[PDB]
Design a protein around this ligand. Structure first.
Ligand SMILES: [Zn+2]
Lengths: 54, 147, 99, 1111, 92, 176, 49
């Protein structure tokens, strides 16, 4: 009956991919129990949690 | 016949410990979408059912080993997990195909490449093209040959 | 080699992938069978569509809405956990399942 | 005449067939009335075989009743199906999209065994769909026809095989049950017989007889003559009956202990416990006929039996022994021969009653499983038949048969003929029927047991040749599903009138002669050596005494749609096939003139197709209209026959019904009262009669192309009406509900002039492609805005306008008026689906005139598109100044082998100008065989040459010499059939006379506006990013593999790169191409297609590390 | 064509000669059986299950017993398997 | 029995529905089924709402929620050669004329802004966020322009008066 | 008992008749075309066949 118009649950907004200035961000080096290190780029004004699901 | 595969393993730096498998990868979700139709009639691309089966049985097995269970239940669970991963990589290969509703065999990962319906002959080689068109022809006996 | 595949290739080396290769490929261990929340119609946490693993459903939008601009690119919301970036990465980010 | 309001169509028939053409929808109607068990069926079942008049539901319930538990301590048994009235009439259901139903009621009775009670209730079994008057079903408003299916009857199928490694015959036997278990007794490469039960291994048959407890002495006494059975008797290596039983159990089961009684009951269970093995009544009758196991005892006990098994094995060993006959102890003897699986004794017809009975029975299976799951569990002396019975699997089973099965087809109608031949159609592919992937080409082939029982001409022409056939004109279905055929028996040269219907085996018993044979109307074949048909298909000149059956008529072998072809006996079978197919694809025009030259099968095929309103009882017309005929019956009562004005058919055509009777005429019981879509004064009329010329005109009629006059466009000769439906709904959402309203965001006012105050357009508005039909807006939500859009909204003061327009626009290439708008509302208390507020349908209709590209065809498979519609001036005209209408091609006639169109053309000119054969110097020679009242005929008088009692080319030659002049003394067409055609273009006469004449041609349903298509940029697919497919969407043409090989074979690499990257899948490249084309820049370099990345992610997900490398 | 390009052994496989010299034409028990006489000589190759449902090769007349043949002349009538004629008469 | 039912409600459907909603869905289905037996008619949702002591909007929400998703790979065509996935228009994709339309709109808007002066075009671009996507407000604009926010409001009022002229509006009205 | 290309069968022999000459010997075969095109060098062609 319908026209078969699909849409995934997502929004598309086309801005320009600008790379000259961004928000400044720190880097948190999380470490798991089995000696594994991972890095999460968090912003400056951002509370870094002690643990993280990597 | 055995020296074929054994020398092929010896030649390369392939380790043969990859025929057993420990971490099953997940195909990204835009390739197995749950698209909302006009009216909320959702449409899953049928890999999500096999992935849900594998996720279910693996979590139940992990719970069972955490619980401490007799050998029969754990072995039955691990056989169920093994058959689930078999269904995921090639449904209908080993014995009974995992059916869907209405007795439809679930399109596993290998069935996206096999047959005429596979990605190769249906979408990789021949593609639908834009700037196309189609009509019934009539004869043009005043045209020139390049027209 | 390539990750976004700009057109200069010579070989396509197939190879039997190991467990280290698969858990090095993926962006997170999916550990929940929940596909999409039944009411709000958004992908769940740690589910098969989870934005923490595969990326954001809306272009430059974290899940908790705290970051929404192009300027916040490549950073991760410290609450919702999603990297705020383009929504086409959900074509291209794989997950894995620790058996 | 045989029909009281028939136009007089003077026939060229020399014969006189006694059996008139039956009630052509009998194959639907009588089967469904058998399913109901209606009294009209019950009297015909009391006509013969009156001992067991049982309906379909009564049979299903009797094999269901009683139903007991695991203990047998409580039994529920049904009884007595019953029907109420229908819940709604036919046109009301067709309007409001309800299915045409009628409620079942079953008197269900529960008995308690231990204490003893009855529980007689009236269980509502479910709303049951019913066949209409005209043979069709109506499912959810759409009209559906369940098409009959051919399957092989369950029985014993003896056959021989050969081996190149042996060069000896290897016989076999396949006892096929319905829903039981197969078993075979195949002599191997050596001389050992072997039982294969349920496709197990070799397993010699003396072991199976010991599993029946038969001693080796009993085998020796039974098979003393049988050498191979003796060798397998000594070679069995297992004695002891239970010692063989454990062998059978171990081969069949393995994974189970012996537990001798469980093996003992299993062989009884697998073949003789009838809840797991049911060869049907057809099966028992066929088996008892095949082996002679029953003298006169009735068909009952539908499980197998040991007597049948031992007779099967004896029949197999005598078949390998080269025996010709065999008597069984306790039964009649039978011949010994193999069986063909294509013979129409071995291929029954599961018609619509059998199909719905099978679906009801498989519904009752799960219902009975639910009952016995429920009956044991719940408490006793509290249950009732209302408690135990869940009708939901039954009603779900019937609904999932009617909707969504490959047999319940969307009923194709774009003329009455396609409806008529879409019923009475034999199909050979379904559940349990042969699929195309397993289709053997032997089943494609006809063979001489189709004569009278099927039509070798009519079948689909694509890849489904020979699978889908059609019933004959005179065919009939036995109560077991075998296909009858009427024959006149002849007793000692006296051709009687005892028209005995015959099935295929009984046709093989006797010999059958042909109706076109010299008969003095006293029996008494003039020729002693008569053509005849033997059993295997042989044609011999048997002396005229052993002939015991004559055909009822000629054209008995042919279908309905092929019987309307004139001069059939001159065409090749390929082009007659194409004529019979493309006679089912005509569209109904707006004038619909009856054909000049026809056959006898137009009037009967129209009044049986149901698309002509027929006066039920005789009387005088009280009042005509365009909407109703109120008749006045002779005894007081009046009755209004409401019309059906401008209905849309299932393929989008006209369905008008103008009345043909006047305000004071008398009608008789059976008179045509209203010409339907493709009718004219009752008889069928699919096209128009057109003046034709057979010259090759200036290359425009090259390679089947047809040119036309402009007279057809100017005078609306070929003008179909096409009625298309559009619909949109208004359903709720998470953000509220969609709103059909006149106010549309971001829209102008000149497009909002068609709309009324509350959405939909006004009736009568002419719309174009891309116009608003239903103004319907949805709540969109709240998105962030781009800054350019934000400041433009700030500049022009327009608000955000938070609703998003997705209105119903009439799509591309569709136009025309708006006939009617039916709107259904949730507030008006209608039956909408859940969460949908307002459903509204819009019927746009146009008047498709003829054009170049439109497919045209005559009645002989001489199809072709329209090359060029010439103006009426530069078209070849006769000496009279009549311009011809179409111009065919010469080179299409001989090399296709259908000069049936040429004979039809000559006879068309004869029937058009009329004739008068001068019988003044006596009747001439050719006219003597010709019947009376055809020696003279008025101009434009219709005649009829039937299919095989045809026109006789000598008599047609004599006719064309003796036609009468037009208006002056002027004979346009000479004796050969060719006129002196002047040229319209230059003006000089053509230097040779050219065959002209009148021809019947139809407007086929392959018009251009349905077929044209183009897309620059439209939608795209979901997973891979390819463009879509089909005219419903935009879509692009499939640039498949063979196109790729052609582009490689040119060496054109760049064009192939464009076609495979930046027109389908290079997703940045598509918008870069569009931007560069519009801006006028160069076409940029293509990138990596998206489907390759999809393949790469699939291979990565299959635990194959697929890296990609530069160096 | 399809059984030729697939390089299957054909249905009507007529064996060919393997060396020059005469032959042992003999109708055995319901099928022919052929031994080849060399000219060097050496190992007389035998062909066993040549079916008498097949027909002998007619050439220039039918093949005589002890008729001198070539290195790779087709002996019966049918279709020579190209696996044989590659092995018999080299890759040329 | 409880663990089988709890696992069934948790792991049956694809879109997972919590157990109270599945309990009321099965209650609705049981009540509607019993009324289809006894009443002999599939009842109205308002009747089912009255029977389950709730509102018909709740009944329609539940009947909306019970619709399990369909398979994207089921054969759409009657001839078994096409799946449902081959007939879904991706509305989320780029319309591919809106992109070139938006780029041309950006060019025309940049031309029209370049008709203005430097302070005017700077104030407009910083007011609407053309340069960064984050539109700064009047006090920050006056801070980068050294002036009051009220002077900036005067300038913005003047430029919105200027832009509303048809001399600039004629080539921008057609972009909506 | 393996099928390798003649362009490789000769050139690899040149790599091995040097450095101590042992000639790898072989006969020409006539492989069928589905057997040929599936036993090809590039696996991406044969994967799509
Ligand atoms: Zn967030």
């Amino acid at each position: 009956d319908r026209v078969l118009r699909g849409s995934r649950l997502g929004a598309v907004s086309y801005e320009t991919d600008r790379n000259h200035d961004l928000a400044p961000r720190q880097i948190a080096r999380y470490r798991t129990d089995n000696g594994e290190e991972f890095e999460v780029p968090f912003a400056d004004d951002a509370e870094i949690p002690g643990t993280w699901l990597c | 016949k055995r020296l074929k595969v054994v020398a092929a393993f010896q030649q390369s730096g392939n380790s043969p410990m990859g025929m057993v498998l420990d971490a099953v990868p997940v195909i990204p979700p835009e390739l197995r979408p749950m698209v909302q139709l006009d009216g909320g009639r959702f449409a899953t691309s049928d890999l999500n059912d096999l992935y849900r089966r594998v996720i279910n049985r693996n979590n139940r097995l992990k719970r069972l080993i955490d619980l401490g269970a007799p050998e029969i239940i754990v072995n039955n669970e691990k056989r169920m997990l093994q058959e689930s991963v078999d269904a995921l990589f090639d449904n209908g290969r080993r014995g009974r195909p995992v059916t869907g509703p209405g007795n439809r065999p679930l399109k596993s990962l290998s069935d996206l490449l096999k047959g005429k319906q596979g990605r190769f002959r249906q979408n990789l080689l021949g593609k639908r093209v834009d700037y196309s068109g189609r009509s019934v022809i009539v004869v043009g006996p005043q045209l020139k040959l390049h027209q | 080699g390539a990750m976004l595949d700009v057109n200069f290739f010579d070989e396509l080396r197939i190879g039997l992938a190991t467990a280290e290769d698969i858990r090095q490929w993926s962006y997170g261990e999916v550990k929940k069978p929940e596909t999409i929340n039944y009411r709000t119609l958004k992908p769940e946490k740690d589910g098969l569509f989870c934005e923490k693993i595969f990326g954001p459903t809306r272009d430059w939008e974290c899940y908790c809405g705290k970051y929404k601009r192009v300027r916040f690119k490549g950073i991760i919301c410290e609450r919702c956990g999603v990297e705020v970036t383009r929504a086409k990465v959900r074509r291209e980010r794989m997950g894995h399942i620790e058996l | 005449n045989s029909v009281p309001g028939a136009p007089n169509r003077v026939s060229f028939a020399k014969l006189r067939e006694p059996l008139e053409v039956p009630g052509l929808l009998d194959v639907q109607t009588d089967s469904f009335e058998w399913l109901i068990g209606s009294p009209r069926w019950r009297e015909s079942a009391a006509e013969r075989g009156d001992v067991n008049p049982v309906g379909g539901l009564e049979e299903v319930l009797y094999e269901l009743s009683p139903i007991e538990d695991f203990s047998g301590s409580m039994s529920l048994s049904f009884s007595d199906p019953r029907f109420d009235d229908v819940k709604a009439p036919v046109d009301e259901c067709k309007d409001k999209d309800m299915t045409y139903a009628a409620p079942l009621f079953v008197t269900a009775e529960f008995i308690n065994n231990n204490t003893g009670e009855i529980k007689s209730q009236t269980v509502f079994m479910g709303d049951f769909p019913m066949m209409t008057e005209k043979g069709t079903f109506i499912i959810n408003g759409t009209e559906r026809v369940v098409v009959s299916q051919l399957v092989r009857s369950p029985g014993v199928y003896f056959d021989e095989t050969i081996d190149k490694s042996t060069d000896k015959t290897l016989h076999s036997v396949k006892v096929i049950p319905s829903r039981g278990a197969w078993l075979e007794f195949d002599v191997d490469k050596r001389d050992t017989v072997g039982v294969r039960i349920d496709r197990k291994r070799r397993q010699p048959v003396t072991v199976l007889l010991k599993a029946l407890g038969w001693t080796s002495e009993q085998i020796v006494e039974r098979f003393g003559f049988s050498e191979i059975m003796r060798s397998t008797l000594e070679k069995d290596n297992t004695v002891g009956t239970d010692e063989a039983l454990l062998d059978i159990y171990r081969k069949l089961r393995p994974g189970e202990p012996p537990t001798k009684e469980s093996a003992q009951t299993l062989l009884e269970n697998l073949f003789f416990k009838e809840k797991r093995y049911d060869l049907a009544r057809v099966g028992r009758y066929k088996v008892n006929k095949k082996l002679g196991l029953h003298v006169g005892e009735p068909i009952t006990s539908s499980t197998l039996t040991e007597e049948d098994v031992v007779a099967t094995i004896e029949y197999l060993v005598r078949l390998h022994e080269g025996q010709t006959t065999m008597t069984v102890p306790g039964g009649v003897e039978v011949p010994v021969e193999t069986d063909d699986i294509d013979h129409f004794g071995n291929r029954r017809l599961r018609t619509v009653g059998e199909l719905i009975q099978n679906q009801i029975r498989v519904g009752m299976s799960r219902m009975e499983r639910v009952v016995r799951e429920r009956m044991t569990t719940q408490d006793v002396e509290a249950i009732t038949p209302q408690t135990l019975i869940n009708i939901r699997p039954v009603v779900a089973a019937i609904k999932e048969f009617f909707g969504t099965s490959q047999l319940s087809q969307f009923m194709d109608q774009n003329n009455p003929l396609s409806g008529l031949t879409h019923k009475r159609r034999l199909l050979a592919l379904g559940p349990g029927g042969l699929s195309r992937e397993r289709a053997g080409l032997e089943v494609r082939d006809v063979h001489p047991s189709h004569y009278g029982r099927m039509c070798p001409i009519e079948t689909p022409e694509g890849p489904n040749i020979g699978l889908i056939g059609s019933l004959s004109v005179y065919a009939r279905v036995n109560p077991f599903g075998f296909i009858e055929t009427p024959y006149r028996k002849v007793v000692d040269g006296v051709v009687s009138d005892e028209i005995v219907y015959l099935t295929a085996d009984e046709e093989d018993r006797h010999v059958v002669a042909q109706a076109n044979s010299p008969i003095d109307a006293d029996g008494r074949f003039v020729e002693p050596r008569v053509l005849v048909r033997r059993k295997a298909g042989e044609v011999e000149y048997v002396p005229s005494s052993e002939v015991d059956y004559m055909d009822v008529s000629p054209r008995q072998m042919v279908s309905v749609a092929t019987a309307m072809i004139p001069f059939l006996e001159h065409d090749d079978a390929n082009r007659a096939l194409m004529g019979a197919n493309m006679q089912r694809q005509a569209v109904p025009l707006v004038r619909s003139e009856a054909p000049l030259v026809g056959t006898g099968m137009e009037l009967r095929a129209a009044i049986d197709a149901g698309d002509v309103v027929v006066a039920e009882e005789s009387g005088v017309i009280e009042e005509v209209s365009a909407d109703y005929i109120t008749v006045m019956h002779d005894n007081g009562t009046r009755r209004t026959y409401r019309m059906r004005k401008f209905a849309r058919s299932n393929h989008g055509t006209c369905a008008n019904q103008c009345p043909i009777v006047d305000a004071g005429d008398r009608v008789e019981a059976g008179q045509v009262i209203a010409d339907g879509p493709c009718t004219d004064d009752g008889e069928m009329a699919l096209g128009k009669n057109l003046l034709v010329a057979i010259m090759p005109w200036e290359g425009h009629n090259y390679e089947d192309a047809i040119i036309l006059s402009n007279r057809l466009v100017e005078e609306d000769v070929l003008t179909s009406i096409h009625i298309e439906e559009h619909e949109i709904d208004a359903r709720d959402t998470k953000l509220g509900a969609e709103e059909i309203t006149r106010d549309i965001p971001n829209i102008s006012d000149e497009v909002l002039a068609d709309l009324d105050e509350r959405g939909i357009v006004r009736i009568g508005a002419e719309v174009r492609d891309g116009d608003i039909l239903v103004g319907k807006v949805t709540p969109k939500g709240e998105t962030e805005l781009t800054p350019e859009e934000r400041l433009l909204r700030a500049i022009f003061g327009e608000k955000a306008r938070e609703v998003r327009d997705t209105s119903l626009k009439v799509p591309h290439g569709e136009s025309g008026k708006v006939i009617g708008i039916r709107v259904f509302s949730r507030e008006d208390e209608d039956e909408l689906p859940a969460g949908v507020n307002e459903l509204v349908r819009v019927y746009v209709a146009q008047k498709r005139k003829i054009s170049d590209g439109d497919k045209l065809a005559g009645r002989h498979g001489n199809k072709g598109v329209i090359g060029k519609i010439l103006p009426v001036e530069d078209m070849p005209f006769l000496a009279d100044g009549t311009p011809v209408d179409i111009i065919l091609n010469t080179h299409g006639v001989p090399r296709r082998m259908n000069i049936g169109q040429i004979l039809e053309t000559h006879l068309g000119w004869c029937a058009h100008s009329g004739w008068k054969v001068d019988a003044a110097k006596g009747v001439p020679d050719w006219a003597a065989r010709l019947p009376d009242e055809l020696l003279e005929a008025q101009p434009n008088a219709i005649v009829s040459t039937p299919v095989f009692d045809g026109a006789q080319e000598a008599e047609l030659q004599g006719l064309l010499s003796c036609t009468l002049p037009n208006r002056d003394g002027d004979v346009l067409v000479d004796a050969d059939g060719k006129a002196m055609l002047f040229d319209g273009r230059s003006g000089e006469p053509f230097p040779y006379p050219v065959t002209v004449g009148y021809m019947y041609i139809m407007k086929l349903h392959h018009l251009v506006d349905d077929k044209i298509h183009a897309r620059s940029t439209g939608p795209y697919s979901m997973i891979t990013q390819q463009p879509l497919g089909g005219k419903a969407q935009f879509g692009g043409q499939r640039f498949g593999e063979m196109e790729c090989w052609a582009m490689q074979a040119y060496g054109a690499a760049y064009t192939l790169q464009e076609l495979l990257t930046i027109k389908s899948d290079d997703t940045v490249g598509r918008v870069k191409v569009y931007e560069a084309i519009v801006k006028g820049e160069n076409i940029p370099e293509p990138g990596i297609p998206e489907s390759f990345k999809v393949l790469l992610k699939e291979l990565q997900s299959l635990c194959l590390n697929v890296e990609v490398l530069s160096s | 064509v399809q059984e030729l390009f697939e390089a299957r052994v054909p249905r009507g496989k007529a064996p060919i000669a393997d060396v020059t010299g005469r032959v042992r034409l003999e109708d055995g028990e319901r099928f022919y059986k052929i031994t080849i006489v060399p000219d060097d000589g050496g190992e007389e190759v035998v062909y066993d299950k040549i079916s008498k449902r097949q027909r002998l090769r007619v050439f220039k007349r039918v093949l005589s017993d002890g008729d001198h043949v070539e290195v790779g002349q087709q002996l019966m009538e049918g279709s020579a398997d190209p696996h044989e004629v590659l092995r018999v008469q080299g890759p040329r | 029995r409880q663990a089988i039912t709890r696992a069934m409600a948790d792991q049956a459907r694809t879109i997972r529905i919590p157990v109270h909603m599945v309990e009321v869905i099965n209650k609705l289905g049981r009540i509607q089924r019993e009324l289809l037996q006894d009443l002999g008619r599939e009842p109205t949702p308002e009747e089912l709402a009255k029977e389950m002591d709730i509102t018909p909007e709740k009944v329609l929400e539940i009947q909306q929620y019970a619709r399990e998703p369909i398979s994207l790979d089921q054969t759409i065509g009657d001839e078994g050669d096409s799946q449902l996935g081959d007939f879904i228009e991706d509305s989320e994709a780029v319309v591919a004329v809106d992109a070139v339309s938006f780029t041309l709109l950006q060019d025309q808007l940049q031309s029209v802004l370049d008709t203005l002066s430097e302070r005017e075009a700077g104030v407009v671009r910083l007011r609407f966020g053309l340069t960064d996507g984050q539109p700064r407000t009047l006090d920050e604009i006056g801070q980068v322009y050294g002036v009051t926010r009220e002077r900036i409001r005067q300038i913005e009022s003047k430029t919105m008066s200027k832009l509303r002229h048809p001399s600039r509006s004629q080539v921008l009205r057609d972009y909506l | 008992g393996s099928l390798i290309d003649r362009a490789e069968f000769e050139a690899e022999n040149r790599r091995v008749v040097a450095e101590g000459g042992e000639p790898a010997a072989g006969r020409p075969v006539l492989m069928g075309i589905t057997k040929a095109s599936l036993a090809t060098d590039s696996w991406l062609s044969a994967a799509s066949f």
